[PDB]
Each structure stands twice: as C-alpha cells, then as structure tokens.
Amino acid sequence: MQILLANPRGFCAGVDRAISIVENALAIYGAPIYVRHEVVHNRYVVDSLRERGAIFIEQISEVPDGAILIFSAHGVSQAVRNEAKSRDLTVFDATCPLVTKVHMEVARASRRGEESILIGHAGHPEVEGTMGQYSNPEGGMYLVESPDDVWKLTVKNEEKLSFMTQTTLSVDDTSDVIDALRKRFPKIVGPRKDDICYATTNRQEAVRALAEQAEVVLVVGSKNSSNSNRLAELAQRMGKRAFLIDDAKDIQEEWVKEVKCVGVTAGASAPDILVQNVVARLQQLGGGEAIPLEGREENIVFEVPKELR
Template sequence: MTDPEGKLSSQTAASPPVIRLANPRGFCAGVDRAIDIVNRALDIYGAPVYVRHEVVHNKFVVERLRARGAVFVDELEDIPHKEQYAGPPVVVFSAHGVSQEVKEEADRRGFKIFDATCPLVTKVHLEVVKFSRAGRECVLIGHQFHPEVEGTLGQYDDNQGGNIYLVESVADVQTLEVEDPGSLSYVTQTTLSMDDTARIIDALRERFPAIEGPRKDDI
C-alpha cells in the first residue's frame, strides 16, 4: 500500500509474511505408489516384507508399515537367507531405486522382488544406461550418499569406456575434470531444488559448452 506521495506505507512494510498451504497436499505419486506396493506385498504374502531403505522419509508412514510387518534394511545382506523361510523372502525396492549391482544380487539370492522405484527415477536410470552404452560421459547433479543418487550412479557401466561424475554444487563444477568434454551429458536427482539445480546446469554449460541434457519437454 502507498501513501499519496507514492511511498510504501510503514504498515505494509512491517506486515508479517503470509504462508498459504495447499489443500489437499501429500506425497508425490511415486511415493504413494511405493507405499501401496509395500501394503500390497503385505496383503499377499504377510509379514515379514523386507524393504531396502525407508520407503519415504516420513517416520509416521514408516512406523505404520513397520507395525504391519515391513522390515526396513539398509543392504540386502541384512536379509536372512531364504533357507530360513518356507518360500523366498519378499523384498521391496524403495521409491529411490537401486543400482544394477543390487538387482543382480537380489536375483542371485532368489528373492521375490517388488520394484517400487519411482517412474521418474526409472526414467533417469534409463537415460544413464543409454549414455553408458553410447560411450558418452555423464554428470549426475545430486547429493552424495542419497539413496537415489547411489542407485543412479550404479546404472552406469564403466566398462563401456566412459565415466559418470557426481557434482553437488557450482563449486564442484568449477573443479570438475572429464575425459571427453565433447561427449558429455547430464542428468539430475529428481528431488532437488529447481533454482539450485538451474544454477549448477548453467555452470556446467559455461564450463562444457558441448554438454547435453534432457529435452525441455522431458520431466
């Protein structure tokens, strides 16, 4: 609000910020899907159902699933061998996704797998696999040690002749050295701040002008 001279009034300037909450609000579709998959596995097979990593970063949801018989583990080695069960252990991969190595280990151990990887994460995985098979180097923008990042890094096959690099910040980009800057692509963790990610992408494009990313119409 302004006074007759066009100056901002002190009342408006001192007003507290207003926070509006959308209603309804909740989890993204990928997390809802993962929760449904864990519940469905429990309905069909009963307890225990092992879930690699917490299906969502929400203690209330995790505790409800745990009360039904879900057992959350950090690694597959934490799951008892199938000889201790009448049938193969039931295992759910969380919405964050897993590496190719984890999938191969689950197959070797004969687990019954429910893959609850978020479809958007799966799409990023497929992009990384494509770059790897084409021999293109890849930069992943994401947070080190995040379960989604670990799974995405694990989609790249170093034996194809390229490399995948992780950057978390503009500062990381400034010190990044790649083997083939003329054959370079990038992907991002799906849960990052858009503003922060945009700054990192701008830095990548400035340092590596030939870098390619997902299409603008591609989420």
C-alpha cells in the same frame, strides 16, 4: 492467526504407489515383507509399516532366502538389483517411474562409454541408485552438487558429455549448476531443462506462494526427506522463519506466539493426517479455519503392478 495451506502439498504419485506396493504385498503374502531402505523418507509411514510387519534393511545380505523383497521408491543401483536377482528372492520394484526414466538414460550413456554428469546430493539413496546405473570404465560418471563442483571437474572427452539430475532438488540451485555446466562444457547434452519431477517443481512453487503471504512456514516432513528440506530452505531464503517437523508435537509455541499468519505445507512423503494434526495444534494456539491457497491441480497417478492388484 490465519492458517494457510500450500497447494499442492503432500503425497506425490510415486510415493502413493510405493506405499500401496508394500501395503498390498503385506496383505497378500502376510508378514514379514522385506524392504530395501525406508520405502519413502517418512517416519510415520515407516514406523506404521514396521508395526504391520515390514522389515526395513540397507543391504540384500540381511534378507533371508525365500523372502519377499521390495526396492524403495528412491531406486537402486544395478549392483543391488543383480545381487537381489542372484539370491533366492521374490522381488517387487517400487521405484518411481520418474526415477526409472533417469536410470535408463544413464544406462544408455554407460553402454556407449560416454561420460555422464549427475547433479545431486552425495550419500542420498536416489543418487547412489542413479550413479549405480553406470559401469563402463572406458567412460565415466561424475557427481556435482554446486557450480564450484562444476568449476573443478575434469573429464576425458568433453565432446561426448551428458547430464542428468536428482528428481527432488531445488529448482533454483539446479538452474545455477546447469548454467555452469554449459559454460564449462559447451557441447554437453541433457533434457530440455532437468530431471526434477512435476511434484518437486509444484511443491516448491506452492511454498513460494505460501511464504509470500505467511510470516512463518511449517513444513511437514522427516529430517532425511530431501524434497521436504528444499521446501523449508526455500521459505527461509525468502526471509521467513521455517521449520521442518514430523508432527504437531514438534511445534514450539514461541514459533507462532504473536504471528498473525502461519503457512503449512508437506513434502512428497508426508501423509495428510500429519497436516490435519498440525493444523489442529495451530488452532489450539489461536489459529482459525485452514484456508487452502489456489494451486496447480496435479492429475498424475501411477498404478501398482497388476501382480500386487
């Protein structure tokens, strides 16, 4: 069994920054450190930070007066931010800059009372954070997940309409949604393509190359990781058996039993150690040396705020 590794895979710049933010805050202020939502959607990262004194919460009200609070990388609504500000809290913001950039455009359209459309998945914290940057009731903010959603949407003023997207979507599916938006709303404005980040684009492209070669694809990522799900989904649509797994323990022998070629990748929130352990498990099942595929070299880094060193 050949073991192939997708390139790129694993940590993006946003995730690495956000984790370091919580780690550094723990190191300088000691435990506990309050974090609104899982800092990134990875069970190993979160349980580790929790064992080190991070307390993960959904709402500001469960955070005590005087505490240190950190927003997760997925971002937060304006309502959340102001509730946090209104309280006696010391606030660090770990939202990825690439999320913030989308937020600022939404805020712009709000100030103008001009309607905006967000392509995203309902209930996802990044969508709630992004939708929550709009508040001017003279306009509006609408969520669409699919072309069918577009085909049902009515707006107040189609001549002044803009769109934004979640950063972790399927590149292919989002192209279909945007196509629909422009056919229905010919005057709609947006970025040149979408707001899907380099990391999401790159990892989907890399899983594409991976599954052209491999018969089975293992995607390291937690169940609530949207971008990780997109990788598994992508490979499955190409007709490959593909599994989303947290660690090597999740691997069932039947999945690879008589497979000559298995591919492995990881979502943007999964640490490399999980992949090495997955590989280690595959080698117990007759896998050889892991061969990393050639891939686009990522070079972007987001520094922690100076205050956090």
